[PDB]
Enzyme design. Structure first.
Site, PDB file in Angstrom:
ATOM      1  N   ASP A 152       5.046 -50.704  26.214  1.00 23.28           N
ATOM      2  CA  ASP A 152       5.259 -51.324  25.538  1.00 23.28           C
ATOM      3  C   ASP A 152       7.393 -50.423  25.497  1.00 23.28           C
ATOM      4  O   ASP A 152       7.662 -49.586  24.886  1.00 23.28           O
ATOM      5  CB  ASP A 152       5.873 -51.579  22.990  1.00 23.28           C
ATOM      6  N   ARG A 156      14.546 -48.463  22.134  1.00 18.43           N
ATOM      7  CA  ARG A 156      13.779 -48.051  21.106  1.00 18.43           C
ATOM      8  C   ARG A 156      12.647 -46.889  21.254  1.00 18.43           C
ATOM      9  O   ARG A 156      12.172 -46.443  19.648  1.00 18.43           O
ATOM     10  CB  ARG A 156      13.633 -49.416  19.975  1.00 18.43           C
ATOM     11  N   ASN A 157      12.014 -47.732  21.848  1.00 17.87           N
ATOM     12  CA  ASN A 157      10.402 -46.494  21.608  1.00 17.87           C
ATOM     13  C   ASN A 157      11.333 -45.562  22.622  1.00 17.87           C
ATOM     14  O   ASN A 157       9.937 -44.150  22.663  1.00 17.87           O
ATOM     15  CB  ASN A 157      10.060 -47.010  22.540  1.00 17.87           C
ATOM     16  N   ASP A 170       6.306 -43.863  21.507  1.00 19.49           N
ATOM     17  CA  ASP A 170       6.117 -45.579  20.568  1.00 19.49           C
ATOM     18  C   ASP A 170       5.500 -45.079  19.626  1.00 19.49           C
ATOM     19  O   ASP A 170       4.826 -45.020  18.815  1.00 19.49           O
ATOM     20  CB  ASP A 170       4.791 -45.898  21.541  1.00 19.49           C
TER      21      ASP A 170
END
Ligand SMILES: CC(C)n1cc(C(=O)c2cncc(NC(=O)Cc3ccc(C#N)cc3)c2)c2cncnc21
Length: 277
Positions: A152, A156-157, A170
């Site tokens: 992922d 945003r992570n 994460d």
């Protein structure tokens, strides 16, 4: 939850922090099972009596999530790199269970890009965007070396700390960042991570715009599986778009290696190329 990481075996036990050494301040966010708090942590690092940390509180009891909690903590203690989120340990005394991480003062990179669009407040310049991209790619070289598949990777992570240091974490399907084989066959590899890195490059160079923002979730799935490519952002030099195209080869074995993508970004960041939109 961690079945895909079965080949990764810890050397040692997780660091344990006494509950009374953590003093919760205020919430920074929530989401994935669930709450994240800013806190002071005592007796953690010799150099400082008290220090700021980020604390995640586990919601479940459970006791399935307790096994997942221990395995997650064991894997996080193995991740030791300049551009990977730094995990400090757990607190298992009393409820809820806590996970302690380094505090990154500038928060998530997606919000950072959006708030520094067209700390030093203002628009990020080409050299700065290249420096952010180089740091994420460095973190991904480390993960590939460990045979760790993130699954992922997205701005945003990532977190931004003192002096614009960027680290991959994460925080909790991210279909828009996935290649066709991940969407269709749930095949997650070093090669699907490089495709997502190409999407992260696109997010950096659009100042945090959502990939395929013009499409619904269904339209995006079909367009990715049919082979459509994200357009070159206005702030993106040709050298950087060529990197994105290399990450986005349909055949996973044809995608550029993360070592080469990182080395190319380092070369560009240490310059940067004379590019004006
Ligand atoms: C956005 C905001 C509210 N925020 C969250 C902060 C966190 O540190 C954090 C919070 N929850 C869970 C985690 N877990 C992970 O990152 C696990 C992980 C997975 C993969 C890799 C790799 N490769 C590395 C780690 C970290 C944080 C710190 N400082 C400031 N804001 C923060």
């Amino acid at each position: 939850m961690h079945h895909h990481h079965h080949h990764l075996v810890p050397r040692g036990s997780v660091h344990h922090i006494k509950r009374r050494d953590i003093v919760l301040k205020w919430e920074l966010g929530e989401g994935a099972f669930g709450k994240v708090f800013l806190a002071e942590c005592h007796n953690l690092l010799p150099e400082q009596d008290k220090m700021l940390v980020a604390v995640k509180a586990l919601k479940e009891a459970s006791e399935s999530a307790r096994q997942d909690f221990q395995r997650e903590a064991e894997l996080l203690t193995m991740l030791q790199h300049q551009h990977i989120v730094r995990f400090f340990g757990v607190c298992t005394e009393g409820r809820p269970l806590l996970m302690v991480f380094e505090y990154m003062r500038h928060g998530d990179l997606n919000r950072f890009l959006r708030s520094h669009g067209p700390v030093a407040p203002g628009p990020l310049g080409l050299g700065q965007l290249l420096a952010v991209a180089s740091q994420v790619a460095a973190g991904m070289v480390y993960l590939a070396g460990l045979h760790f598949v993130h699954r992922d990777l997205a701005t945003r992570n990532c977190l931004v700390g003192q002096g614009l240091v960027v680290k991959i974490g994460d925080f909790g399907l991210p279909i828009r960042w996935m290649p066709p084989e991940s969407i269709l066959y749930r095949k997650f590899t070093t090669e699907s991570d490089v495709w997502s890195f190409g999407v992260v490059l696109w997010e950096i160079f659009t100042y945090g715009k959502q990939p395929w923002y013009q499409l619904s979730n269904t339209e995006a799935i079909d367009c990715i599986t049919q082979g459509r490519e994200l357009e070159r952002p206005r702030a993106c030099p040709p050298e950087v778009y060529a990197i994105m195209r290399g990450c986005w080869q349909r055949e996973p074995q044809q995608r550029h290696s993360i070592k080469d993508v990182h080395a190319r970004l380092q070369a560009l960041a240490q310059a940067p190329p004379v590019y004006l939109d």
